[PDB]
Amino acid sequence: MNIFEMLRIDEGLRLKIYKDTEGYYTIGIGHLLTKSPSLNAAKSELDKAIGRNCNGVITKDEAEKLFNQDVDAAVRGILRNAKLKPVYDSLDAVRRCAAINQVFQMGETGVAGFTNSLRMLQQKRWDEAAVNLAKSRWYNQTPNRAKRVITTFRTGTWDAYK
Ligand SMILES: [Cl-]
Ligand SMILES: [Cl-]
Numbered sequence: 001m002n003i004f005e006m007l008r009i010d011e012g013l014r015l016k017i018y019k020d021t022e023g024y025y026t027i028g029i030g031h032l033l034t035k036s037p038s039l040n041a042a043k044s045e046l047d048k049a050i051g052r053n054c055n056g057v058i059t060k061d062e063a064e065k066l067f068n069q070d071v072d073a074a075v076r077g078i079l080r081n082a083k084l085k086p087v088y089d090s091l092d093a094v095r096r097c098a099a100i101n102q103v104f105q106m107g108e109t110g111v112a113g114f115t116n117s118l119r120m121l122q123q124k125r126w127d128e129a130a131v132n133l134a135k136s137r138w139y140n141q142t143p144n145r146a147k148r149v150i151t152t153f154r155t156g157t158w159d160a161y162k
Helices: 005-011 037-052 060-080 085-090 093-112 115-122 126-134 137-141 141-155
Strands: 014-019 024-026 031-034
Touching: 005 024, 005 060, 005 085, 005 093, 005 141, 014 037, 024 037, 024 060, 031 037, 031 060, 031 141, 037 141, 060 093, 085 093, 085 115, 115 126, 115 141, 126 137, 126 141
Parallel strands: none
Antiparallel strands: 014 024, 024 031
């Protein structure tokens, strides 16, 4: 298992514009296009990202290409955050995949206000972090996914991904 396979499992793959669980236009492998409710802004954004007139549809390759850049951006985002970097660098490789997944899903922003859990993960208080993390809108809105990421942080293994 690796980050791509884990996220490809959590986000799925769709080649036609779609609305995510928050109702926002997305495409590919969880690639958020825009928060606006105008399908047209969404398509403009898509064309701009891909580099061609897509008409709301892309290829697998284009999808994978956007996914590559998004994983990259997520990690770089972590590395550049002063509150995140130190935590991330303290974790083992499996758990680092769990950190990337959260940031890919919620942004550097979302994740940066999990201060208490961050502290707990840094101190390697797994079970404690796990209970804390569940006390969140993230877990209540997308519990099956949140459960899988939380178990990954708690155990350091890929068992939730079986
Ligand atoms: Cl792009
Ligand atoms: Cl879910």
